[PDB]
Each structure stands twice: as structure tokens, then as C-alpha cells.
């Protein structure tokens, strides 16, 4: 009857759908590779999809996935066992080398742009009409790291213009230079900002940005990468 016809068609439609959905989520990271960068033997039962191309808004180009894949960058790691399946030790300093939880990707070295084609993220000082509107304003607070030692002072907040939110604190070092800390890895307390991922001596180590009113996607990754990595790697000093 009609109902057993409907339920049985549905199970089929649902298999088709899982299929579509599963291949659709292969537009990235595939094909699978062995530990050495080589195409793996067994790829799974799902084929890659026919490619798609997104048109990028600001004469910024194209993305066509799936496509040829690569880190466009060295990986300071080496094998620690004699077969597939084990960890790969950092060959140098994992924070400095951006591996493990300090990793970053070779994202594009320009800034995300808003819908109007302007930089999405600006230091508040360059952002017309933008001020702190609720909560404790961190600007001027000393920044203290997980060793409980002061590593600098907050000198501006970098804001997302179209979404009107804090995204970084720009912090000044003994140096007189500055660094971005991601807004999401800091505690704004009443008389200080607390940063648990890093100890005071690792602030200098934060990747730096090439211009003081822009960040590029690439730079953002090296920054976020670095400070998250600190949770594992600073933890001795902590």
C-alpha cells in the first residue's frame, strides 16, 4: 500500500541524501594521504564530488574545491615510531615553528574585507564613531600572563566594523612594539587583563603584523595559532 510505498521511497531518498551530504563534505582535506604526504591506498567508499567554484567578492578571485592540496609551508615535525599511527615530535620549538596546537594555516596574506570592500577589522582609533559601550574598557589595563608577571599594557581594542565586536586587544611590550592577543583568550578583570595561555617571556614571541592598521588572514592565523599553542607549550613556565 501507499504508506509502505512512501516509507520505502523515503529510505532510498535518505540514502541518496547521505551520499550527497557525505561527498559534499570531501571538498577539503581529500584525497587522504599517508603520513609522508603521498596519496593513501584506501580512500573510503565515497568518490570526490565534481568541483565547484565560489566567486570571491572583491576581485579577490576564485576557489575551486576539490582541487590540488597543500600546506603552502614547511612542517617542523618528525616521525617517532616506525609505523603509521603515532605522534610526530616537533623538530625545533613548536610555538616558533607553528606546529601542534600552535599550528597556523597558509591563509591569504590580505585582510578579510567587509561587504563594502573595506578592511573588516581595524584598531578602534582608526574606526570612526566606534567606542566601548558596556563592560569594563580594557584600554590602559596592564596585561598579566600565566606566570603572574606583567607583560605589557593594553593600548587599543581591534574591532570588527560590520559586526561591531571586539576581536583583539593590541598590547604594548617593554620593547615599545605591540602585539595582537585574540579577544577570546583574555580575561578582562577589574584592575588588569589576565592571559592564561602565555607567560610573560612568550609575548615577544607572538607573530607580528606588517602594518599597524590592518591584519591579514595569514597574520591572524599565526597570532591565534601561537597563543592557543601556549596552553600546551607554555605550561612548564606557567
Amino acid at each position: 500500500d501507499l504508506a509502505s510505498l512512501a516509507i520505502y521511497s523515503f529510505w532510498i531518498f535518505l540514502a541518496g541524501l547521505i551520499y550527497y551530504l557525505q561527498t559534499e563534505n570531501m571538498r577539503e582535506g581529500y584525497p587522504l594521504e599517508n603520513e609522508d604526504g603521498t596519496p593513501a591506498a584506501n580512500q573510503g567508499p565515497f568518490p570526490l564530488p565534481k568541483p565547484k567554484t565560489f566567486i570571491l567578492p572583491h576581485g579577490r578571485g576564485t576557489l575551486t574545491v576539490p582541487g590540488p592540496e597543500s600546506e603552502d609551508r614547511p612542517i617542523a615535525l618528525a616521525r617517532t615510531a616506525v609505523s603509521e599511527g603515532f605522534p610526530h615530535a616537533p623538530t625545533g620549538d613548536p610555538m616558533k615553528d607553528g606546529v601542534g596546537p600552535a599550528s597556523w594555516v597558509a591563509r591569504r596574506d590580505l585582510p578579510e574585507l567587509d561587504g563594502h570592500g573595506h578592511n573588516k577589522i581595524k584598531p578602534m582609533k582608526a574606526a570612526a564613531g566606534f567606542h566601548v559601550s558596556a563592560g569594563k574598557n580594557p584600554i590602559g589595563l596592564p596585561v598579566r600572563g600565566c606566570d603572574l608577571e606583567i607583560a605589557g599594557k593594553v593600548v587599543d581594542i581591534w574591532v570588527d566594523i560590520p559586526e561591531q565586536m571586539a576581536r583583539f586587544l593590541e598590547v604594548e611590550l617593554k620593547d615599545g612594539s605591540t602585539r595582537l592577543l585574540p579577544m577570546q583568550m583574555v580575561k578582562v578583570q577589574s584592575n588588569r587583563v589576565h592571559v592564561n595561555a602565555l607567560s610573560s617571556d612568550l609575548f615577544a614571541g607572538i607573530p607580528t603584523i606588517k602594518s599597524p592598521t590592518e591584519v591579514t588572514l595569514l597574520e591572524e592565523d599565526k597570532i591565534c595559532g601561537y597563543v592557543a599553542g601556549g596552553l600546551m607549550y607554555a605550561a612548564p613556565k606557567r
Binding site: 504508506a3 509502505s4 523515503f10 559534499e24 566601548v132 560590520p162 561591531q164 583574555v186 592557543a228
Partner: protein
């Protein structure tokens, strides 16, 4: 260690009037107020809304639906404020008795009011559907919202219009009341042999639950990777960063497979849409084709 559920600092600049695309700006209002409260959680800006014609048709019959049910409730209260408030959840605007079949000839005070209210609802929902398509068209955006909303419309259509029609009467449709509609629901199950035997019901649940599962996963994942700008999903789609990478990898190490930043949204749209898709067939088949889900289930056909 901070968790990104509430913002620590809010930040305000000039009110955002939004992208002009092909939108007719004659029709956007002006900005509303800025809510500091809202802004601990999400955006602080209220407005501007776009209203124009189809918008107005919609807002109007919406209100008319609501005030139809509203005068009947006050009537049922014998015009007494104290009673109204007391018995708010017990008032109910029922459809025509089974004797009037599909005809619009029922007395106002015994189901005519129901059809009137239903009429206002029908145009409020559909016009709103159109608004869903058209606000997208004007921005140059794809039509996903409207298609997804269509899934919701399906169940609602089936409950109050398509199923009562195939069944031969309006008495079969759902009343307007807080408690009465729960009764209608329990009673619907009972009369049809227990909806737990309706395999579309069972699927429906899997999706409903599955939505809570997915959105909890997805939300949690994004917050977890939001220290790498994870929430800026579109730009992670156009140029994968470590946020999209470490989110895929968490799932991949946990359950052995994983999604892409764009692919996850397809899982989401479908998980949710399938709840009502599913559900609507479930109901549609009931009484029109299966009279008892237990019974049907015994011969599997």
C-alpha cells in the same frame, strides 16, 4: 579560562544600515534602539526592518488572525478581565462540527470564526513565505531560507488544510488554544493506534533529537574554535584557516569522519528540514490511508 558565551566588552559604532543591493530602500525603516542587554549575547542593534506591501499584507492578516481568536476568547470569558486572565489557557476556538463537512456554511459562533481565523492565517503564512524568497532575491542570495521554511509550512499545511480536505471535513483540523491543541494532539495519537507505530513519526523524532545533537555539536565546535576566528564561517569557507582545520580534526579523531565548514551547514539544513518533512507525510497518511498505526505495523503493510 574564558568561554565566549557572554561578551566581556561591548563595542558600538554608527548604526549599520546594511547592504543595499537591489533592495528598495524606500521600504526599510530607520534603525531601532540599541540593546545593551541583547548585546552581551549577540548583536545590540535593533532594526532596521523592511516592510513593503507583501510585508504589510502579512503583518495585517497576522494581527487579524490573532484578534479573531482574541475576541472569541474574551467572549468565552463573558467580557470579564479577571476571568480572561484566569482561564487563558482553557479558552479554545474550535472548527466546525463534522456535520458541515467542508462547507463554509457553519454558524459564526460554532466554527465560522474558526474558518475566518484560519483564512487570516493562511494569507499571513504564505505572504510571509513570499517575503522569505523576496528578501533573498533582493540581496542576490540563494533561496535556502524559503525552501527550508517550506518544510515547516508543509506540516502546518497538512495539519490544518490538506488533511482536513482529503478527510472530507474541517472538524478534523486543529483548534486555536493553548490546552486544547495539546488535547487534539494526544487525542489524534490515540484515535490512530499510537503514533509510536507510525514510522514517519519515529523518523521525525530522530531528526528532532538529531537537531538538538547537531546544533549542540556545531555551536560547541564553533565556540571552541572561536579563538581562531572560527565564527566567520563564510571566509573560512573561501579560505580554510586553522579554525576550520582543528574543528574537522576534532570530529575526525573523535568519531572517525568529519565535515567541511560549508558541508556542516548542509547537514544542518537537512537535519532540521527533515523533522517536518517526515512529520508531514506522517500525519498526511493518517486516517486517509492508515487508520491504525499499530495494525498497519503488524503486516508491515
Amino acid at each position: 579560562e574564558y568561554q565566549n558565551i557572554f561578551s566581556q566588552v561591548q563595542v558600538r559604532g554608527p548604526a549599520d544600515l546594511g547592504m543595499t543591493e537591489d533592495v528598495n530602500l524606500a521600504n526599510r525603516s530607520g534603525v531601532g534602539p540599541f540593546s545593551t542587554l541583547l548585546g552581551w549575547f549577540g548583536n545590540a542593534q535593533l532594526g532596521p526592518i523592511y516592510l513593503g506591501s507583501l510585508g504589510v499584507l502579512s503583518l495585517f492578516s497576522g494581527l487579524m488572525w490573532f484578534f479573531t481568536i482574541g475576541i472569541w476568547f474574551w467572549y468565552q470569558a463573558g467580557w470579564n478581565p479577571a476571568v480572561f486572565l484566569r482561564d487563558l489557557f482553557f479558552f479554545s476556538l474550535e472548527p466546525p462540527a463534522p456535520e458541515y463537512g467542508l462547507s463554509f456554511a457553519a454558524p459564526l459562533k460554532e466554527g465560522g470564526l474558526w474558518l475566518i481565523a484560519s483564512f487570516f492565517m493562511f494569507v499571513a503564512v504564505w505572504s510571509w513565505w513570499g517575503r522569505t524568497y523576496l528578501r533573498a532575491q533582493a540581496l542576490g542570495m540563494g533561496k535556502h531560507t524559503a525552501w527550508a521554511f517550506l518544510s515547516a509550512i508543509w506540516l502546518w499545511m497538512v495539519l490544518g488544510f490538506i488533511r482536513p480536505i482529503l478527510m472530507g471535513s474541517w472538524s478534523e483540523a486543529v483548534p486555536y488554544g493553548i490546552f486544547s491543541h495539546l488535547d487534539w494532539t494526544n487525542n489524534f495519537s490515540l484515535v490512530h493506534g499510537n503514533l509510536f507505530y507510525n514510522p514517519f513519526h519515529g523518523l521525525s523524532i530522530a531528526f528532532l533529537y538529531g537537531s538538538a545533537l547537531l546544533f549542540a555539536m556545531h555551536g560547541a565546535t564553533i565556540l571552541a574554535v572561536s579563538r581562531f576566528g572560527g565564527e566567520r564561517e563564510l571566509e573560512q569557507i573561501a579560505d580554510r584557516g586553522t579554525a576550520a582545520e582543528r574543528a574537522a580534526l576534532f570530529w575526525r579523531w573523535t568519531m572517525g569522519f568529519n565535515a567541511t565548514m560549508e558541508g556542516n551547514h548542509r547537514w544542518a539544513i537537512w537535519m532540521a528540514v527533515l523533522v517536518t518533512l517526515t512529520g508531514g507525510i506522517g500525519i498526511l497518511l493518517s486516517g486517509t490511508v492508515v487508520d491504525n498505526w499499530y495494525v498497519w505495523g503488524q503486516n508491515h503493510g
